[PDB]
Amino acid sequence: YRLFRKSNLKPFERDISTEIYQAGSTPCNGVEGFNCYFPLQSYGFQPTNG
């Protein structure tokens, strides 16, 4: 799932992109670092989970 996006989606809009999300004021030149997160995160589904 996507955790960071510059803006909300439109209805039935798909945004498969994987560019680095600039949380901070500084460009990140598509690298991972402070205030430069990856937008894609995943779930850890476990059979023992709530």
Partner 1 sequence: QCVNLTTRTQLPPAYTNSFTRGVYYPDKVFRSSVLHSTQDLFLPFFSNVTWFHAIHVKRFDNPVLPFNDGVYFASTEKSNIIRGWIFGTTLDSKTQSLLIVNNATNVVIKVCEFQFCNDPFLGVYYHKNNKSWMESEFRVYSSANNCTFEYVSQPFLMDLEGKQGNFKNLREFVFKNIDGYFKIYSKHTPINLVRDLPQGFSALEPLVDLPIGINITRFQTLLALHRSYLTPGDSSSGWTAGAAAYYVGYLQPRTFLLKYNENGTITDAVDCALDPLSETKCTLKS
Ligand X SMILES: *[C@@H]1O[C@H](CO)[C@@H](O[C@@H]2O[C@H](CO)[C@@H](O)[C@H](O)[C@H]2NC(C)=O)[C@H](O)[C@H]1NC(C)=O
Coil, strand or helix at 9: coil
**What's the CA angle centered on 35, arms 29 and 41, to 5 degrees?**
90
Which x/- pattern over 10-49 shows residues binding partner 1 (rule: CB under 8 A)? xxxxxxxx-x------------------------------
**6 vs 48, beta carbon nearer partner 1:** 6
Rounded Cα distance between 48 and 26, Å, is: 41
The count of chain residues that interact with partner 1, using the rule CB under 8 A, is 9
* Residues at the interface with partner 1 (CB under 8 A): 10-17, 19
